[PDB]
Amino acid sequence: QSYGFRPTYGVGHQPYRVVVLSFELLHAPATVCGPKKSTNLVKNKCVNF
Amino acid sequence: STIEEQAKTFLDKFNHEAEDLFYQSSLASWNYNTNITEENVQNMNNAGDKWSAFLKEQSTLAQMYPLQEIQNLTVKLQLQALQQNGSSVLSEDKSKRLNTILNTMSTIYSTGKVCNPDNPQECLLLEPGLNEIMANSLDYNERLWAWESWRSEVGKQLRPLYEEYVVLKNEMARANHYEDYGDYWRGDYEVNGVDGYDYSRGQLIEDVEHTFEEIKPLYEHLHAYVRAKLMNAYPSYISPIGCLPAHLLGDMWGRFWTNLYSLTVPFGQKPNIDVTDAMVDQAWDAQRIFKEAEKFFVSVGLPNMTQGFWENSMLTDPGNVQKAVCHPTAWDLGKGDFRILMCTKVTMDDFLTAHHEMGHIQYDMAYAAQPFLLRNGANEGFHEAVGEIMSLSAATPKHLKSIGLLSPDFQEDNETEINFLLKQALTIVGTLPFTYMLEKWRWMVFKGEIPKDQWMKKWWEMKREIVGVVEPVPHDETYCDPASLFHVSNDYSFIRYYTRTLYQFQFQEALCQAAKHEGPLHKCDISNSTEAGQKLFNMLRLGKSEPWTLALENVVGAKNMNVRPLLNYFEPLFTWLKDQNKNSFVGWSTDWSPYAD
Ligand SMILES: *[C@@H]1O[C@H](CO)[C@@H](O)[C@H](O)[C@H]1NC(C)=O
Ligand SMILES: *[C@@H]1O[C@H](CO)[C@@H](O)[C@H](O)[C@H]1NC(C)=O
Ligand SMILES: *[C@@H]1O[C@H](CO)[C@@H](O)[C@H](O)[C@H]1NC(C)=O
Ligand SMILES: *[C@@H]1O[C@H](CO)[C@@H](O)[C@H](O)[C@H]1NC(C)=O
Ligand SMILES: [Cl-]
Ligand SMILES: [Zn+2]
């Protein structure tokens, strides 16, 4: 069926882009991992590396 | 399987296509009315023709659908509305003939110009010549001559054409299972398929007669007061007991008696309700008027308006660069597009008309969820009723006091209240008896009880009885005075004004009772009363999907129309008129006539 869009239409009819994420937390070798952002590298001070 | 889901799916398809088709048609109409160009007229014509062709196609498609017995309350009503084609139920030749005759009286009424006897080349149409002469020239002779010219130059060409029009309308009604075209117009008010709320087609006549019988003393007293005042103005033109002349009613036909007010004001030295100078001083503009009206409906319990209306609608004069007919009109274009045309000046007339237009838009919005064939009022007199009740509520001086539109020291007195009630009577009440007379004459003509050679030979007798007005100039059967109005010559009904007035009084009384109002009904405001707003919005959202009497009970609790709110509203006027008319004859005499002495 035709699925066109127009700007005159109000809220609820303007086109929306949506994306999905499928995860898997089953115990398996890890491939995609996070870098945990970063912190400044302190030196010569008792810290938690 | 059965025809239920078949009709359901067909009506779904009809809704899907008709939404877009009416969207295109309304967009073309809005383009034309805001921009007077030949291309816009052609676009409107094409859109209307395509919509008519699609309606013909849908009626043809639904014809094979059996009547059977389906009681979903939507599908049956939709197919019943689609089936009543009307002009196309007879043969093609007869349809062409009725189109020819329709255009005949339409063009004759539009171009029924009258030329002065002293200058044949100087001719005036109904507008602005006759309207200005009627509303400004108070001379007896000029008004009488204008009446004679308008009812003489046009009726001769209309009499047999209207005869054939009546015959053809009776034919169309009989072919569609109505006894007369009057019954065809009753069919809108017909209620069936519901238990305990059925309304018969004869019940309309019964209720109309009963209500007019109760109203008769009010019209008698008002006409007696008008006769006394005009006899004071015209000593040698009005009998103390005789009927008033047709041209001394405030208009040309008897439709509205507004122009009599300046000649019939009880206390003309007291100021009249007019705050134009107030908005001029406050540097107001039409956008402020619309914003205040939206705020007032927010106060009474309505949600605010969407940005699409304010982006698309026009609320002022667009000038002559793109011409526009400045008659204030509303559009529900479909697909959630709502618009209004209005050339707004800084006036109270424009203020009241703007409340009508935007509350009328709100009323249209109330039934948005209803399907296409259910996007209409339950009967022909609810949208105008909503507009008029909003105008009356916003017209109350206290409503202006709260928002500072007038100086608080107005000091509402008995004289001002009686003046306002007299204006209402000569504006709203003054049309009820004339409307009843014309509608009764049309009904009796369509039904076939009035011989042609006696048509006006009934009218001008009942005019001496119902309206209490005697014709000033004798006319033979060639003239066609009873059909010399806009409604009769443009193929429209006339009971809508009576029904709308009754409904508006009942609705206002219901809202006032739901607003905890104390005192006279005329000093009642609905501002800051969300209970009454929601109570009325319950009726507003129903639309025509349900019988009109259920909607009526939903707000007033009465299953039959009644005039008790009219008495409650006009009781001070009744008392004042009865006190004033102690030494004057009450009623009118049929025998008296200006042309016979
Ligand atoms: C008004 O109509 C003319 C001719 O039909 C057209 O050229 C013009 O674009 C229209 N105005 C608007 C605002 O569309
Ligand atoms: C009438 O039809 C509508 C549309 O399918 C449906 O939602 C409603 O339930 C029906 N009414 C009854 C009483 O079955
Ligand atoms: C209408 O009222 C709602 C409720 O707060 C508000 O969010 C919206 O902006 C208002 N719309 C306009 C046009 O003022
Ligand atoms: C309605 O309420 C508003 C705000 O509460 C107020 O400004 C206004 O004066 C009230 N109107 C009346 C008639 O009481
Ligand atoms: Cl008439
Ligand atoms: Zn309206």
Side-chain angles (χ1 to χ4, degrees), chain B residues 259-283:
Chain B
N259 287 311
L260 304 182
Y261 166 63
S262 295
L263 282 181
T264 60
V265 57
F267 309 100
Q269 315 202 238
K270 278 279 190 164
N272 162 255
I273 293 190
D274 186 11
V275 297
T276 298
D277 294 337
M279 283 74 74
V280 172
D281 279 355
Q282 301 171 23

Side-chain angles (χ1 to χ4, degrees), chain B residues 330 356-361 364 383-384 387:
Chain B
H356 166 111
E357 297 317 311
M358 183 278 288
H360 187 273
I361 283 295
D364 301 337
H383 62 87
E384 282 304 300

Side-chain angles (χ1 to χ4, degrees), chain B residues 31 34-41 43 322:
Chain B
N31 291 320
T34 54
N35 184 9
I36 301 296
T37 61
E38 190 65 38
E39 178 184 37
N40 274 325
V41 187
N43 284 262
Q322 53 179 357

Side-chain angles (χ1 to χ4, degrees), chain B residues 42-241:
Chain B
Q42 275 156 261
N43 284 262
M44 183 177 176
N45 279 320
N46 263 16
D49 291 331
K50 286 198 181 192
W51 174 235
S52 283
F54 183 74
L55 271 179
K56 201 173 303 305
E57 160 75 12
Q58 300 302 119
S59 299
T60 309
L61 266 165
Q63 261 173 21
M64 301 136 278
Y65 281 80
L67 198 151
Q68 206 181 358
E69 183 64 18
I70 193 169
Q71 191 269 330
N72 177 252
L73 301 179
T74 65
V75 294
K76 172 55 61 180
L77 179 51
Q78 286 136 10
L79 66 90
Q80 192 268 334
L82 200 47
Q83 273 174 355
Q84 46 178 356
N85 58 338
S87 167
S88 85
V89 75
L90 282 71
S91 84
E92 287 102 341
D93 294 331
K94 293 181 181 179
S95 300
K96 294 204 303 152
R97 293 175 184 178
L98 62 84
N99 270 339
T100 288
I101 293 161
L102 277 170
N103 261 29
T104 303
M105 62 295 297
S106 181
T107 58
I108 289 182
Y109 190 84
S110 67
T111 70
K113 51 179 67 67
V114 285
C115 315
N116 290 318
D118 292 331
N119 199 6
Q121 71 94 26
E122 171 183 33
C123 310
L124 294 174
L125 290 178
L126 183 140
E127 179 70 28
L130 321 183
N131 185 58
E132 188 267 330
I133 282 177
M134 183 278 288
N136 298 93
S137 180
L138 296 185
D139 173 85
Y140 186 94
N141 285 340
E142 196 186 356
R143 293 174 65 96
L144 171 60
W145 174 90
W147 176 91
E148 168 70 13
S149 59
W150 175 246
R151 268 165 172 83
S152 80
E153 203 270 329
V154 193
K156 272 165 185 275
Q157 310 175 48
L158 291 169
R159 184 68 180 251
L161 274 300
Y162 273 123
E163 297 176 342
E164 203 168 334
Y165 156 80
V166 168
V167 169
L168 279 159
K169 292 290 166 174
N170 268 345
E171 290 180 22
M172 270 162 304
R174 294 167 213 280
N176 278 118
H177 312 108
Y178 313 83
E179 62 184 0
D180 52 355
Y181 204 58
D183 205 49
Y184 167 86
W185 275 345
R186 308 326 178 79
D188 185 77
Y189 288 81
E190 194 205 70
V191 176
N192 200 0
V194 65
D195 279 301
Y197 280 78
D198 285 328
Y199 196 91
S200 84
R201 299 206 282 252
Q203 200 68 45
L204 188 79
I205 304 108
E206 290 146 25
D207 293 333
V208 159
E209 275 182 349
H210 183 92
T211 49
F212 193 69
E213 279 287 323
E214 324 278 343
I215 292 171
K216 264 186 188 181
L218 176 52
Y219 181 53
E220 280 190 34
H221 264 281
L222 289 158
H223 189 286
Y225 171 76
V226 168
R227 172 179 53 195
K229 298 300 289 188
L230 286 181
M231 183 177 176
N232 285 345
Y234 305 96
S236 80
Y237 289 122
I238 283 147
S239 177
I241 66 162

